[PDB]
């Protein structure tokens, strides 16, 4: 019966603020709650607070007071969360969630990306293939912030490709490797390009990998 639908993804700057919306459709009555939940990429869920549409009662998670402001419009059946004084710690997907009778519903999520004050494009170094399958790749080092995007031979090479999840180095900069396994007989006859895109710095780096 109930459909939660949220606002589009936000791309904002440090110190700024955003207001996300969650419209609840399918309710005839106001006797329902909207819960807000935070999920940083590859992390667990964190509860932010809730707002009750009957009387606009509120509860915040204490560590989000001052960060999150919750408001509700009964008239358009829309809940809002405002996030203020944005930092890198705030970049996440924000879900809304609600219950109705025996059912439970979540919105599609709203991704908030807080941009970096200093951006670094990846240094892309070849992982050169020194039993009958060879491994080769590209080391994608010292980029910031997330994300990176790696392709091989402009999309023509996919089987055997592993692009590893980024690891945050001691330098605060991300590093990853993208590798492929190919038949060793092809090393002298097939060219291998890794295509790396890092959009925060408009970096597109296409790197040749030869034995």
């Amino acid at each position: 019966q109930v459909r939660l639908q949220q606002s589009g993804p936000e791309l904002v700057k440090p110190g700024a603020s955003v207001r996300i919306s969650c419209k609840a459709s399918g309710h005839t009555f106001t006797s329902y709650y909207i819960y807000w939940v935070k999920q940083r990429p590859g992390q667990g869920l964190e509860w932010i607070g809730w707002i009750y549409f009957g009387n606009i009662n509120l509860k915040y998670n204490e560590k989000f007071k001052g960060k999150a402001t919750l408001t509700a419009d009964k008239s358009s059946s829309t809940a809002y969360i405002q996030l203020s004084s944005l930092t890198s710690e705030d970049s996440a997907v924000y879900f809304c969630a609600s219950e109705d009778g025996p059912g439970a519903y979540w919105g599609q999520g709203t991704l908030v990306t807080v941009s970096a004050a200093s951006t670094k494009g990846p240094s892309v170094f070849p992982l050169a293939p020194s039993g009958g399958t060879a491994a080769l790749g590209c080391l994608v080092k010292d980029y910031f912030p997330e994300p990176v995007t790696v392709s091989w031979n402009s999309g023509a090479l996919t089987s055997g490709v592993h692009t590893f999840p980024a690891v945050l180095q001691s330098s605060g900069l991300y590093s990853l490797s993208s590798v492929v396994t190919v038949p060793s007989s092809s090393l002298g006859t097939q060219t291998y390009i890794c295509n790396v895109n890092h959009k925060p710095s408009n970096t597109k780096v296409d790197k040749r990998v030869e034995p």
């Binding site: 869920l45 998670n61 025996p102 439970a104 240094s123 170094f125 080092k141 590893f164 999840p165």
Partner: protein, 213 residues
């Protein structure tokens, strides 16, 4: 804050098996505990409320149980669409707290890693920093241990692992281990080896090169 501990970060199952995902609360939360499912990209889906009651639309193979401090989500007769991450949550007191999550992954035959080692590129050697990379390719199960031995000396602190999500075609994992040195220290050592122990390896395999081919 009440801590919801899910001691199992990964669990393996076959289709048809029965699995139990466990959750322990740091304080007494009665039965006010919920369970959620999340697949990559998708929003979380609420499964259980009050420890043992199903939300609307939840199949009967999802049974929750437990009370007080210990809670369990059991999935009987696992289907392919049940492979996901599972979170427990308490709502008995504020703040409401989720657990760390348990990823339910597909069981398969043991597969030993194909091991490869890459020397640093001469390009990067100009950076004053040298990165040696060791790849463990398409292995199972997830558990692996990599050691870096430079001129036979065990390394520590100066290395970082990264592991892929389970493959949706052959159900394997892959792992990369990167050893970061200064070009200074790289040039005053000769043998570079990554040592791989794995359940599919009948004895530990070391892959290595001598600086200078």
């Amino acid at each position: 804050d009440i801590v919801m501990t899910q001691s199992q970060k990964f669990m393996s199952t076959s289709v048809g098996d029965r699995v139990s995902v466990t959750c322990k609360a740091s304080q007494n939360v009665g039965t006010n505990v919920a369970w959620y499912q999340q697949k990559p990209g998708q929003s979380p889906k609420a499964l259980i409320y009050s420890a043992s009651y199903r939300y609307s639309g939840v199949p009967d193979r999802f049974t929750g149980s437990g009370s007080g401090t210990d809670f369990t989500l059991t999935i009987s007769n696992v289907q392919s669409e049940d492979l996901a991450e599972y979170f427990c949550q308490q709502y008995n007191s504020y703040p409401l707290t989720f657990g760390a999550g348990t990823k339910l992954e597909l069981k398969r035959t043991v597969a030993a890693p194909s091991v490869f080692i890459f020397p640093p590129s001469d390009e990067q050697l100009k950076s004053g920093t040298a990165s040696v990379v060791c790849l463990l390719n398409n292995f199972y199960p997830r558990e692996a241990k990599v050691q870096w031995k430079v001129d036979n000396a065990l390394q520590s602190g100066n290395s970082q692992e990264s592991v892929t999500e389970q493959d949706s075609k052959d159900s394997t994992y892959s792992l990369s281990s990167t050893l970061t040195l200064s070009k200074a220290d790289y040039e005053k050592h000769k043998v570079y080896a990554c040592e791989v122990t794995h359940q599919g390896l009948s004895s530990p395999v070391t892959k290595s090169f001598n600086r200078g081919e």
